[PDB]
């Protein structure tokens, strides 16, 4: 296994950790704030996923400072992970095209 496929795997594992920790911390941050909906773990996890994927339906979102800071970490982890996968795919294709051209 080369570097790019290693970093991609690591980013995927790390993303899973961020989703789980993010769901836990979001509930912890949002409870205590009147009107907050991000307050139970199952839907918090669903919120984490759609935050990391950038979909953001808007059915759930943080209203507190720390809940929003947690969200930012989830967003960045998502953008970085999927960005790291795209870069890895590009490296794979560049290398294969390099061999195909006999260089």
């Amino acid at each position, epitope marked *: 296994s080369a570097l790019h496929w290693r970093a991609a795997g690591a980013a995927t594992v790390l993303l899973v950790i961020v989703l789980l920790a993010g769901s836990y911390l979001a509930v*912890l941050a*949002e409870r*205590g704030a009147p009107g907050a909906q991000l*307050i139970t773990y199952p839907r918090a996890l669903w919120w984490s996923v759609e935050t990391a994927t950038g979909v953001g339906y808007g059915d759930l979102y943080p209203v507190t400072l720390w809940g929003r800071l947690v969200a930012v970490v989830v967003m960045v982890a998502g953008i970085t992970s999927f960005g790291l996968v795209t870069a890895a795919l590009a490296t794979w294709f560049v290398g294969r095209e390099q061999e195909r051209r006999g260089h």
Partner: antibody
Amino acid sequence: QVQLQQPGAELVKPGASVKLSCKASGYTFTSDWIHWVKQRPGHGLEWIGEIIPSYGRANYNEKIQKKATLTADKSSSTAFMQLSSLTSEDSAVYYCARERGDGYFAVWGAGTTVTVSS
Amino acid sequence: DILLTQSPAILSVSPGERVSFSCRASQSIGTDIHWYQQRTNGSPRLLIKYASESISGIPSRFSGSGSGTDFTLSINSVESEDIANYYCQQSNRWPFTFGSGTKLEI
């Protein structure tokens, strides 16, 4: 086995303070919240506050005067509620309940009847 | 905060007859409502979670329905042990709140 164990009763003098206990058993998770509910005779259920033992953070009902302070001990799996400066208005049954972080109170304690009197 | 209205406060029914308790939320809360039973001198007891999901140990004659703002707890053929107070509770928005409760009479 009884998941939540509370003392039967507590007698408190007007102005004094009392710490109610709630010893938990059964399955315990990091996502567990312990809630406290106040019920006056003839009246309904009134939410007081919550605490997450795995982190120690507590939240309280903003609609009522804060006379409670929630703490927890992970070593003995026991939740505590510190009621301070009590009047006859504070005389009620105080239940503790366990929520698995999914919104509902799966199990309740037997309740601690608190009487404020001289 | 979310207000839960339970009306009527008292429901009189004949034995074996179907009864329905109503719970109305001050705003839309999907299906995040839960039902509890409290008999005389007893502690509350979970009957239905998430509006309609049954609980292990609870008689099949207990059921729930509704979504949004209007929720209903139903009892098929009320018997004597069903005499109690019935409370609804929401978990959609912080803080959790309880309804005022409905008493069942036979």
